[PDB]
Paper text:
Once inside the cell the terminal glycine is cleaved by a dipeptidase (PepA) to release Cys-3M3SH (2), which is metabolised by a C-S β-lyase liberating volatile 3M3SH (3), which diffuses or is exported out of the cell (4). While the PatB enzymes are poorly characterised and the genes are not associated with amino acid metabolism gene clusters or operons, the orthologues from B. subtilis (PatB) and Escherichia coli (MalY) are known to have cystathionine β-lyase activity, suggesting that these enzymes might also be capable of Cys-3M3SH cleavage. In the course of a typical PLP-DE catalysed reaction, upon substrate binding, the ε-amino group of the amino acid substrate displaces the lysine residue from the PLP to form an external aldimine.
As we were unable to capture reaction intermediates by soaking ShPatB or BsPatB crystals with Cys-3M3SH, we sought insight into the mode of substrate binding by growing crystals of ShPatB in the presence of l-cycloserine (LCS). LCS is a known PLP-DE inhibitor, that forms an external aldimine complex with PLP thereby inhibiting ShPatB. In ShPatB, we infer this arginine to be Arg376; in the structure of the inhibitor complex, it forms a polar interaction with the C=O of LCS and is well-positioned to form a salt-bridge with the Cys-3M3SH adduct. Moreover, substitution of this residue with alanine abolishes activity both in vitro and in vivo (respectively). Tyr25 is part of a sequence divergent N-terminal region, and this residue is found only in malodour producing staphylococci. This N-terminal region is often unresolved in PLP-DE structures, and indeed, we could resolve this region only in the ShPatBLCS structure. To gain insights into this constrained substrate binding site in ShPatB, we examined a unique tyrosine residue (Tyr25) that extends into the active site in each subunit with the phenolic side chain projecting towards the PLP moiety. The PLP adduct of Cys-3M3SH was superimposed onto equivalent atoms of the LCS external aldimine bound to ShPatB so that the α-carboxylate of the substrate forms the conserved ion-pairing interaction with Arg376. In this conformation, the side chain of Cys-3M3SH projects from the deeply recessed PLP binding pocket towards the protein surface.
Numbering used by the authors:
A (entry chain B): -4 to 341, 347 to 398
B (entry chain A): 3 to 26, 41 to 402
Write the structure that this text describes.
Amino acid sequence: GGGFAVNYNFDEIIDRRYTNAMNVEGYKGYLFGDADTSDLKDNDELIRMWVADMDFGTPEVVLNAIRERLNKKILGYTNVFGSEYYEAFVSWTKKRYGFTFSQEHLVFSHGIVAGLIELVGYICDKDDKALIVTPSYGPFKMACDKNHISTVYSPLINHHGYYEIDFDDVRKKVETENIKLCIFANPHNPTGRVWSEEELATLGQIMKENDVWLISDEIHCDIKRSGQSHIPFAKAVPDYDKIITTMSQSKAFNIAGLMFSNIIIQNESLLKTWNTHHFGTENPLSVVATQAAYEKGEGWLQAMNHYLDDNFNYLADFLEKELPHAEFKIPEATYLAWVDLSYYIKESMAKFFIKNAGVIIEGAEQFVHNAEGHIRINIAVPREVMKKGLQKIKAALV
Amino acid sequence: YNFDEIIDRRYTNAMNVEGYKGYLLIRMWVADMDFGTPEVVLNAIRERLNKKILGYTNVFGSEYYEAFVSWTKKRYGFTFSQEHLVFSHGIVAGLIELVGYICDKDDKALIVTPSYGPFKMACDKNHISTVYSPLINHHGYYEIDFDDVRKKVETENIKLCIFANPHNPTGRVWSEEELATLGQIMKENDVWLISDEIHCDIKRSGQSHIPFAKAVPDYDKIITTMSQSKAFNIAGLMFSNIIIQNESLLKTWNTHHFGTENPLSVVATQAAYEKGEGWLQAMNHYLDDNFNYLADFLEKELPHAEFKIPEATYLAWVDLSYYIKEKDIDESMAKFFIKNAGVIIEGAEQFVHNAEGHIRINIAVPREVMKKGLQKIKAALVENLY
Ligand SMILES: Cc1ncc(COP(=O)(O)O)c(C/N=C2\CONC2=O)c1O
Ligand SMILES: Cc1ncc(COP(=O)(O)O)c(C/N=C2\CONC2=O)c1O
C-alpha cells in the first residue's frame, strides 16, 4: 500500500556529523570559494538552513529497497533494462499531472546539474546565448559558463515576494539577442512560484515563435503546499519538441547523494546525439532507491509536505511578530523560504549571518541577479531547529 | 569465505546478465565478478543507511586520504600528497575529463595494443585521434616495442599516452625497468601519461605492483587512476581516485570539475581500503587456483591454443587463431561461442587492434562455473576436427 497508515516523526533530530555531508562540512567552500575565511570563528555551533537537502530522513521504504538490493551481494555494472523503471516513473507523472511520455524519450543523468551541463553542450554552438529569469538557481548560469555559452537575464517582477515573469522583457530579449536556449525552473527556485498553465503557455509561445529550446527543470515539482498542482512545461506546451523535462526523486525523497535523474528528450535529433555521445552506466543502489520512491513513496511524501506546510505557517507568524519589516510570502512550492531583509541591511549576507547569528543561509550572491537584500532559508528541518535558527536571525537584524 | 557460492544475478539490472545481446548461458565476458562484494564492504554501506539521510556528499577532511595512502604505502611503498588526490565517477569518466583538459584539437593520443577499448573511446569523445603501438607477442608473453613507441612520439604530435598498469587484456605486470624506460621516452618528448592502475590489486602470487609514479618519481605529468571497483566488485558505485601531480592541470581540475560524490560509494570504497585486505588476499588465492586449472585444461584439451597465465587481472587472453583458420570461422568468436557453446566471452573486436584470433575469458567465477564454460568452449572448437 501507499504508506498512509504509518505515523512518521519529522521532529526527529538526525545527527549528520561524520557523514561527509556538504550541509555540515562544505559551507565555506560553496558560499565563499577561494576567499579568506580566517575571520569566521571555527568553534561556532552553526544552525544549518542553506543547501537544499533535508534534515528529514530518507523514508524507510526507500532505504529498505537499498537494503534488499545489498542482500543480492554483487554491486556490478548496472543499467536500466526492461520497462519496470519507466512504468513506475510515467505512472507517477500520469497520476499526479496527467503527463505521459514514451519510454524511448527517457534518458538518465547523474544529477540534474550534470544533465544540464551535457544538454547545453549538445544544444548550443559557440556564439549561441542562453536566457534565464532572475533571481535564479546558480548552476543554471554555471552550466552555461562550463560550455562557454553567455547568459542573458530577464529579471522577474516582484510584488512583496510574489514573483512573475516579465513577458515583454523575455520577448524583447529573445527577439533581439541570439537566444538559443532558456533554462527554466518549474517550480521556481528561489521564489517558490508554481507556474500556471497560462504562464507556461505564454512563455512557450515566445519560445516556439523564436525557435528557442527550453529546459524545464522540475526537480521541486512534488514539494508544494497542500492543494497546489504541478503542470509540466511539456504538458502546458505539448506541441513543441524542443521542451526538455528534468525530474528526479533527489529533492522530494532526500537522495541527492544518489545522483540519478530523469531527462525527457522529445527531439529525435538531440536524442540521437544523447544516445550516441552520453557516457555512463548507472548505480544499482541509486536506481532501486529512486524506483522505490515512485512505487511506494506516496504516503510519506504527503506527510512530509504536510509538515513542511506547518513549518511555513510558523515561519510566517514568526516574521509577522518578530521581524515585521521583513517581506515574505509563503511559497507555493519548495521547502525554501525567500525573505526580503532590505529594511534591516546596513559583506555577503551569508557571511553576515554566519558571523553575527551563527546561522548558515544563502544570500543574494548565490542567486545570480535580482536578489538584493534577500536570504533563502531552508526549512526542511524539525520545527525545533527552525525555531532556534529564526531566533538567531532575528537577534542579528534588530 | 566461500568463493564457490552461486549468487543469483537475475532481476538486478546487471549488464553482465541483461546486456550481452547489445554490447554486440554461461557468462565469462564483461569484467565484473560473480563473487560477492565482501560483507565488510556491504556492512559499511548498511551502517551508512542507518544514518538515514542520503544528501549531498563530498570527501571532507583526511580520513579517506589516510585510508587510501596507507593502502598504497603498505602494498607498493607508494605515497602521494593529499592535495593531488581528486575524484571521478569511475575511471572511464575520469579519462574522458582528463583527455579534454590535456589535449587540444590536433594533439594525438598513443595507446599500446591490444587495449581496453574505452581508452580509444575517451579520445574519440574529445575528438582526439589515437595512434597505436602494437605490443610484441612471444607466445602470449607481451612486451612493449620501445623502438616503435619512440618513433611514434618523435614523428607525430603525441600529447598523451593512456597506459594500463597492469595491462588489460594481456595481464602484464610491468617491471620497474619497463616502466622506467617508457617513462623516460615520455619525459624526453613532453608527453603526459595516464597510468590506469585499476587491476593493480588483482594479481598472481609472486607478482608485485609498481605504480608508474613510483617507478618514475621525477615526472609530474604522470597521472595515476586507482579504484576499488575491480578488486571489490563495486563498479556499479562509480567512484574513483585520480592523482594529479602537475600543478597547472590540478588547478584546471579544481576550477572546472563539476560533481559531488555518492555517500554509499565513498563509504564502500573507504571500507575496502580500511577492512578489505583479508578478503582480497583470499579472493586472489582462489583466482590463482582458477588460473592453474585453466592452464592445465588448455594444455591438455586445446593444445593448439596459445595462453600464458597472466601476471594480473582475472581475465584470460587466449589465442584461438589455429582453430579459426582450420574451421574457417567467418563470424565473430563471441557469436560463435554464444551459438555453439552457450558461453559468452569477449572477442578480439573489443580490444581495438593487434587482437585478431584472441578471446578474453573472465574467470572471476566459481571454479565449477569456469569448468563448465571451458568444457563447452572446447567442445564447440573441436567439433569435426581431428
Ligand atoms: C532548480 C534546480 N535544478 C537542479 C537542482 C540539482 O538537483 P540534483 O539533481 O543535483 O539533486 C537543484 C538543487 N538545488 C540546490 C541544492 O542546493 N541549494 C539548491 O538550491 C535545483 O534547485
Ligand atoms: C584498464 C581499465 N581501466 C578502467 C576500467 C573501468 O573501470 P571502472 O572505473 O569503470 O570500474 C576497466 C574496466 N574493464 C572493463 C569492464 O568490462 N570489460 C572490461 O574490460 C579497465 O580494464
